[PDB]
Amino acid sequence: ATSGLLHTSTASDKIISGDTLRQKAVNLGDALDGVPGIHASQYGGGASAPVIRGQTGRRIKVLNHHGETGDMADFSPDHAIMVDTALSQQVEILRGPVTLLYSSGNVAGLVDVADGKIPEKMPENGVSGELGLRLSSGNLEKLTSGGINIGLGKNFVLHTEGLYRKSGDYAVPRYRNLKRLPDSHADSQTGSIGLSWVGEKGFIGVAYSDRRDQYGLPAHGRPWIDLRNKRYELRAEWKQPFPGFEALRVHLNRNDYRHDEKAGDAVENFFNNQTQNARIELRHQPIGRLKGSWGVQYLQQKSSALSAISEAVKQPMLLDNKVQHYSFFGVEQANWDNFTLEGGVRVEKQKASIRQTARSFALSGNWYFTPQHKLSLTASHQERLPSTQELYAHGKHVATNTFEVGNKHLNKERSNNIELALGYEGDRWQYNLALYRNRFGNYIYAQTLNDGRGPKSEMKLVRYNQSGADFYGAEGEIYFKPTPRYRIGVSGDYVRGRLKNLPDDQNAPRVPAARLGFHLKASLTDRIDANLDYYRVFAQNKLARYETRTPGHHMLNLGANYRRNTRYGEWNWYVKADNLLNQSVYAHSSFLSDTPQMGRSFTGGVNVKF
Ligand SMILES: [Zn+2]
Ligand SMILES: [Zn+2]
Ligand SMILES: [Zn+2]
Numbered sequence: 001a002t003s004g005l006l007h008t009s010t011a012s013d014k015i016i017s018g019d020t021l022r023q024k025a026v027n028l029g030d031a032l033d034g035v036p037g038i039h040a041s042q043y044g045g046g047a048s049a050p051v052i053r054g055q056t057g058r059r060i061k062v063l064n065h066h067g068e069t070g071d072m073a074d075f076s077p078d079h080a081i082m083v084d085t086a087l088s089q090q091v092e093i094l095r096g097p098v099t100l101l102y103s104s105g106n107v108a109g110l111v112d113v114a115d116g117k118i119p120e121k122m123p124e125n126g127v128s129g130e131l132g133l134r135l136s137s138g139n140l141e142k143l144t145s146g147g148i149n150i151g152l153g154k155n156f157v158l159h160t161e162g163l164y165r166k167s168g169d170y171a172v173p174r175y176r177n178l179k180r181l182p183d184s185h186a187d188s189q190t191g192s193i194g195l196s197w198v199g200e201k202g203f204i205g206v207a208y209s210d211r212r213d214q215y216g217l218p219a220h221g222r223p224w225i226d227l228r229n230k231r232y233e234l235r236a237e238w239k240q241p242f243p244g245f246e247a248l249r250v251h252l253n254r255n256d257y258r259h260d261e262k263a264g265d266a267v268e269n270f271f272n273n274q275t276q277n278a279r280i281e282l283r284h285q286p287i288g289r290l291k292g293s294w295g296v297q298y299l300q301q302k303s304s305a306l307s308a309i310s311e312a313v314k315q316p317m318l319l320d321n322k323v324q325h326y327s328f329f330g331v332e333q334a335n336w337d338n339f340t341l342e343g344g345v346r347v348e349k350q351k352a353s354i355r356q357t358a359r360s361f362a363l364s365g366n367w368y369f370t371p372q373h374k375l376s377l378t379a380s381h382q383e384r385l386p387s388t389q390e391l392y393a394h395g396k397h398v399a400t401n402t403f404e405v406g407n408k409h410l411n412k413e414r415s416n417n418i419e420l421a422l423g424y425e426g427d428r429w430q431y432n433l434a435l436y437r438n439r440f441g442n443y444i445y446a447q448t449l450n451d452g453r454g455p456k457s458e459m460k461l462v463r464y465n466q467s468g469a470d471f472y473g474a475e476g477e478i479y480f481k482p483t484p485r486y487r488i489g490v491s492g493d494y495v496r497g498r499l500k501n502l503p504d505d506q507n508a509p510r511v512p513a514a515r516l517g518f519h520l521k522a523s524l525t526d527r528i529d530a531n532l533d534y535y536r537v538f539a540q541n542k543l544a545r546y547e548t549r550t551p552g553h554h555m556l557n558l559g560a561n562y563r564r565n566t567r568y569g570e571w572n573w574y575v576k577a578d579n580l581l582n583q584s585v586y587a588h589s590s591f592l593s594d595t596p597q598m599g600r601s602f603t604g605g606v607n608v609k610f
Contacts, residue, residue, distance in 0.1 A: 002090075003066065003112035004098045005249050005283045006293040008333050010340045010366060011423035012109075012434050013375035015092040017228065021085050022132055022607045023559065023574045026143060026165055026188075028081050028111075030064070032350070034533065036493045037109075037434075037475045039512040040094070041590040042597055045139070045167050045186035046215025046225065047080040052093075052108035053436055053473060054495040054511050058387060061103040063112045065549060067233065068299065070255020070275035075389060077591055078399045080213050082229050082257065083113040084190055086132065086145040087161050090114050093417075096378055097331045097344025097362045101281075101295070104346060104360050105384025107438055108419050114405045116192040118165040118205030118235045119149050119157040127610075129161075134574075134605025142166040143605070152195075159207075160192040173582045173599035181595070183222055186215035192231075202238025209233070217399050217455060218595050221264025225399065232255040241282070249281035249295075253553025261399050267308065268398045269317075274302040274420075292332035297348075299325035307395065317404055321388045324351040340366040350385050356412060358385050374423040384413045384532070390444055390464045400591060402460040405449070410466060414441040427484070432478035443469035445509055448546040457594070469508065471497040477517075485524065491517035496542065506545055512589040513550065515538035529561040540588050550588035556580050569610025576603040 001009050014035070025031040028047030033040040039051040049056050057074040064083055071082040085091070091113055096559035099106035120136035123129075132145035141331040148163040156217075165188040189212050196205030209231040217223040218462045232254040241248035242527035254276045281295035327348035334341045335593075346360040362380030368373065421434035446462040474497055479489030493515050497508030517536040539552030558580065562573040579585070585597040 001092055001094065002114045003063070003094055003331075004101070004331075005247060005281050005295075006291060006331050006333065008096055008340070008364075009094075009329060010096045010364060011421040012095045012183060012378075012419070012433065013093065014432075015090060018088060018090050018334075019572060019607075019609075020413065021088065021091060022134075022145070022572070023561070023576055023603075023605065024085070026085055026111075028083055028085060031085050032091070032093075034517070034535065036094075036477050036491045036515075036517065038302075039515070039589045040587060041077040042587055043078040043590060044184045044215060044218045045170055046115055046188075046213060047073070047078055048590075049081065050111060051075040051512050052111075053475070054471060054497055054508065054589075055108035058384065060108050061104060061106045061110050062509075063102060063110070064255075065113065065117065065252050066117045066235070067250075067251045067253045067279070068255065068275055068277040070231065070253070070257050070273060070277070070301075071229075072257065072259070072271060072273055072303070076397065076400055078217065078361055079259065080215075080225075080227060081202050082211065082231075082255070084115055084192075085113070086143065087147060087163055087190065087192075088113050091589040096364050097342050097380075098359055099380070100344035100346040100356070100362055100382070101329050101331060102297075104348065104358050105382050105413055105415065107380070107382060107415055114350070115192075116141070116147060116161065116191050117159060117207040117233070118196045118203065119159055119194070119238075120196060120203045120205065120235075121199075122157060122198045122432075123149045123151055123156070129159075130609045132606060132607040136167070137602035137604075138171040139601060140169045141603075145607075146570055155198045157196050157198060159192075159196070161190075161192050163188075163190040165189070170598040171601065172596050173504060175584075175596055181218060183216035183220070183224070184218050186213070188213040188215070189556075199238065201240050203235065204236045205234070207231075207233045207235065217261075219592050220398075220401060221266070223261075223263050223399065225259050225261055226259075227259035229258070232256075242283065245282055245284050245291045246286070246291075247283040247293075249283070250267065251277075251279050251281075253277040261397075263398070269305065269307050269396075271305045272303065275569055288389075289336075290332065290334040292330065294330035295328075296325040296566075297329065299327070315394050317393065317397065318389060319354065319392060320351040322351075322394070323388060323491070324353070325349075326351070338368045340368070342366075344380075348385075352388065356385060357413065359385050360384075369443075371457060372423070372425045375421075376423075377420045379416075379418045382415050382417065384415075386410055386412065386444060393464065400460075402456070402462055405461070405463040406547050407464055410444060410464070411442050413444055415439065415443075416441070427481070429478075429480060429609065431476070431478035433474075433478075435474050436472070438469075438471040440469040440471075445469075445499075465497045466503065468501040469497065471508065477519075478533065479519065485522070487521040487523075489519040491519060507542050509544045509587055511542065511544070511592075513538060513552070514538045527563040531559045531561075533559075535555045548593065550586050550593050551584070553583040553585050554581055555583065555585065567610060572607040572609060574603075574607075577601075578603070
């Protein structure tokens with residue numbers, strides 16, 4: 001776990017390796033689909049938000065290596081997330097006090113994408129990195145990833161990575177009378193440069209990262225988003241700052257983001273986000289077994305979103321605003337031999353210039369009976385301040401086709417959370433189970449209106465209104481291996497929410513359906529690793545104020561890897577087939593509930609590691 005400076009890993013946490021992510025999809029929400037707990041809020045082939053336990057947007061949090069993504073994915077699911085899955089070293093899903101180190105109101109879980117912009121190490125044999133290439137049938141995709149590390153002398157290490165994606169209109173099963181879904185194509189390209197130092201003591205690295213996606217918009221010339229993302233960042237960390245401390249960490253950032261929701265070659269809605277995050281973390285010495293780490297964060301996001309109409313005539317959806325976070329945070333764990341008790345805190349001040357104070361804190365205890373055998377309980381009272389969107393909304397959004405309305409008098413989102421989990425692994429039997437339960441004293445949500453003033457899949461109207469809520473659900477998995485050479489297992493998840501006491505007792509908006517999963521993986525022999533995954537997704541009968549029924553399909557995915565150690569590093573061949581039954585995959589979690597996802601599709605790729 002690289003996200004936490006202080007390691008406070010709970011039983012609920014999990015880390016997917018990089019080699020597997022090259023075989024998975026490119027989008028964050030779609031690639032992480034299959035893992036128990038997280039569902040995909042797919043909005044075409046361009047963007048997809050990860051729905052962690054029926055939570056999304058600002059309720060979750062995504063970080064681009066110990067720093068803010070600087071994106072507008074939290075605004076709506078159609079917006080792309082500025083994180084590179086195919087270029088990342090490893091993705092890691094985390095919960096507990098470590099959530100309070102970065103963001104407020106992170107009730108579901110943190111998802112830090114560790115990338116290789118800055119090496120932080122002298123590469124083996126001078127140079128290192130990787131190269132990739134894969135084509136998907138029916139999409140039709142053309143991915144070409146890349147990554148290079150160069151030893152520029154004794155202690156300097158230069159890094160240069162590249163990526164390019166080109167997917168047309170993907171195929172749909174039994175959708176009226178269409179072979180491919182119109183306006184669902186998604187082209188993209190990503191590249192980054194980074195120069196770093198190497199220890200002892202530590203590293204002092206800079207990095208530039210550029211991205212430019214071009215994707216259509218299903219469900220509305222031709223609707224499409226053209227975005228540009230420039231990121232000027234700086235990372236540094238060493239093991240000996242000054243006496244009485246074990247580590248010093250700093251992650252400066254400047255993420256310039258922009259996207260144009262166009263229709264043909266004309267711009268209907270402009271967007272902008274001048275993020276510039278700064279943070280100074282430090283991990284003090286162990287004061288008798290117990291360890292901790294404190295830090296300060298200074299963030300400033302000058303975001304805005306205008307339309308084709310001028311400012312003099314109509315009020316924009318999101319006028320120019322200058323948000324400033326002045327956050328203080330810290331964590332402290334106490335290792336009592338076979339029992340770890342950790343507690344985090346976070347206090348931040350908001351200055352919305354065109355001043356309330358947030359106060360979050362958590363506490364978690366982890367009992368280890370006989371490692372690996374992790375029993376863990378967690379509870380976190382988190383208070384998230386409302387964004388400028390939730391208060392100052394008064395315009396139309398052409399991509400979703402929904403008029404967003406705000407409110408001048410709203411309170412902060414307080415939330416008393418609680419969750420427990422039991423993990424185990426020991427050759428023959430392996431299983432991870434977890435229960436979560438979230439109470440919200442104040443839960444702001446997009447209440448579908450209704451009139452109103454007058455007069456008005458056509459044109460939707462929403463207003464951010466307060467409400468009490470109560471979420472609860474179970475999630476986990478189990479793997480019984482008869483022989484280490486093979487691997488068999490079963491997984492499952494469930495989520496349920498309601499809204500109690502309005503200023504009654506209705507269901508939550510867009511709740512993911514239950515998904516049982518069957519798993520197989522046979523590695524015969526050594527190099528060739530075959531596998532099979534059957535995800536049975538049931539229908540969601542419990543619908544919200546203004547929603548419809550959603551199935552309810554039998555998903556089936558197969559795969560077959562192939563390792564090879566030749567000259568110039570390792571080679572990784574792989575062939576993956578998705579949805580052999582060709583079922584009509586309708587996702588209620590996403591906004592595009594009536595639109596079916598990609599049907600039958602194949603994949604064949606090669607990745608050279610070195
Ligand atoms: Zn870092
Ligand atoms: Zn007005
Ligand atoms: Zn949008």
